[PDB]
């Protein structure tokens, strides 16, 4: 029920002259906006990406962000001229700002900055501040940024008021896609394990939405505790993929099943039995010469 809204900025500076800034916006695991360096305007990746804001209210925010993009670029190049030669090109700056929606009329905002891959600065209260363990040569650039009372005032406004106000409406406009249910599809395969005389059983689960899922190898009522749950891998159509593997001794596969529990299945779990007729036919349809197989 808790949704985190994230504005991610990626800025690359190769030398004094060359630079590019690309941004993406997320509401939970759904991309809502895109702003390529090449593009003059913020793009909607959803039909409800404008939220409850008006075309007038939206253009006011878009102009502010257009001015910011231009300014940020020149301001980074200047703060580099201040740190010279303690910091030099190429420079990578990342920025993550947003708010996460809590139950009731409650929400906390954040603005984190990472420099050359490492988290270094945040906006907290009314100022920019370095994080503990941040390098000493960042104190003077943070002092010059804190001198700019105008930027500080608008950042406070965006974090305290604008972000929650906008996201409350964004949840309204996008409710149909956030609570969208896509059913998973599971299939089986096996590879040799790293250990001699062992096999690794693979249960593939793809195309489910939302992300929470339960995948377990079973033997009747007994959950195999060797089940290794893989990471969530994304699909191109906003669904998820997950693998769950199980190391077994060659010949122990018969009796094993892969159970999948998901909200979209309405209590009707997917139970995939290893040596069943469905599996045999599925396995015969995905045979190959094994050329360039991994090292399993």
């Amino acid at each position: 029920k808790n949704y985190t809204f994230r504005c991610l900025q990626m800025s690359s500076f190769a030398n004094r002259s060359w630079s590019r800034t690309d941004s993406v916006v997320w509401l939970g695991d759904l991309q809502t906006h895109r702003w390529s360096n090449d593009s003059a305007t913020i793009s909607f990746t959803k039909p409800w990406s404008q939220g409850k804001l008006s075309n007038q209210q939206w253009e006011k925010l878009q102009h502010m962000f257009q001015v910011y993009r231009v300014s940020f670029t020149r301001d980074i190049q200047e703060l580099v001229k201040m740190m010279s030669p303690k910091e030099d090109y190429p420079i990578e700056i990342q920025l993550s700002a947003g708010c996460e929606m809590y139950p009731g009329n409650a929400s906390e905002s954040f603005l984190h900055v990472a420099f050359q891959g490492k988290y270094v600065v945040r906006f907290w209260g009314t100022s920019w501040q370095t994080v503990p363990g941040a390098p000493s040569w960042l104190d003077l650039p943070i002092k010059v940024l804190n001198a700019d009372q105008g930027t500080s005032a608008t950042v406070q406004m965006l974090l305290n008021d604008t972000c929650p106000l906008f996201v409350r409406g964004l949840l309204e406009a996008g409710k149909s896609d956030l609570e969208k249910q896509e059913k998973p599809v599971a299939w089986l395969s096996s590879v040799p394990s790293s250990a001699h005389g062992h096999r690794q059983l693979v249960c593939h689960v793809s195309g489910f939405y939302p992300k929470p899922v339960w995948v377990m190898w079973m033997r009747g009522d007994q959950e195999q505790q060797g089940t290794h749950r893989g990471d969530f891998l994304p699909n191109a159509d906003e669904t998820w993929y997950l693998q769950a593997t199980l190391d077994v001794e060659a010949g122990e596969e018969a009796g094993l099943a892969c159970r999948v529990k998901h909200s979209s299945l309405g209590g009707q779990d997917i139970i995939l039995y290893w040596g069943s007729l469905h599996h045999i036919l599925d396995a015969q349809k995905m045979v190959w010469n094994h050329r360039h197989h991994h090292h399993h």
Partner: T-cell receptor
Amino acid sequence: TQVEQSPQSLVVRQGENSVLQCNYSVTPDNHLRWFKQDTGKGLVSLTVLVDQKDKTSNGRYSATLDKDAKHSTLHITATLLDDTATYICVVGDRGSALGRLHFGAGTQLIVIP
Amino acid sequence: EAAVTQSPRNKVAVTGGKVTLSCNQTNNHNNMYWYRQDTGHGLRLIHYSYGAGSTEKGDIPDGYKASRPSQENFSLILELATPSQTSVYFCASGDEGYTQYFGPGTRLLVLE
């Protein structure tokens, strides 16, 4: 040229009022400052305007700023002879030392007794 | 009150000559700036500095070199003086804030 000052020259009779204009296209425009440059001397700050629609005073000097029209007006009431100088409009593009100053060419004011 | 001094107040040089314009500031201001004033133009930024050892090019750096040996001093060097460098030179200093404090000016006439 991103900071244009009007008129280029202005002759006023002693004790009379003066109106100096500044139009600019600088983006972003954090603040606008007015300077007095006595002939052969340096720049002395008369006033600074920072708000979207701002107004400021300093004795006989008074100034307005409209950030939507990108326009500032400087008023000198009961002009004395010592007011003969060049008045320069400066626009700051940041609220810190990361900014650049954009200078107008000035308005030459001649106070005649 | 914040103040900046410049030397010499007036200078005469010949084409191909070498001129050094100096700026002194004791406000403990990290940032220092060099401008030229010409008729029909506003002050134009030549070079600037963010601290001792630092020198950054401005908008019109061609024909000028700069040196910030210490916090208090900033110099403008013209290794090869040309008559187009005939101008009034202004030096300024500042802290992390947006105000610059201007020096009194140096008049430079470059002759054939």
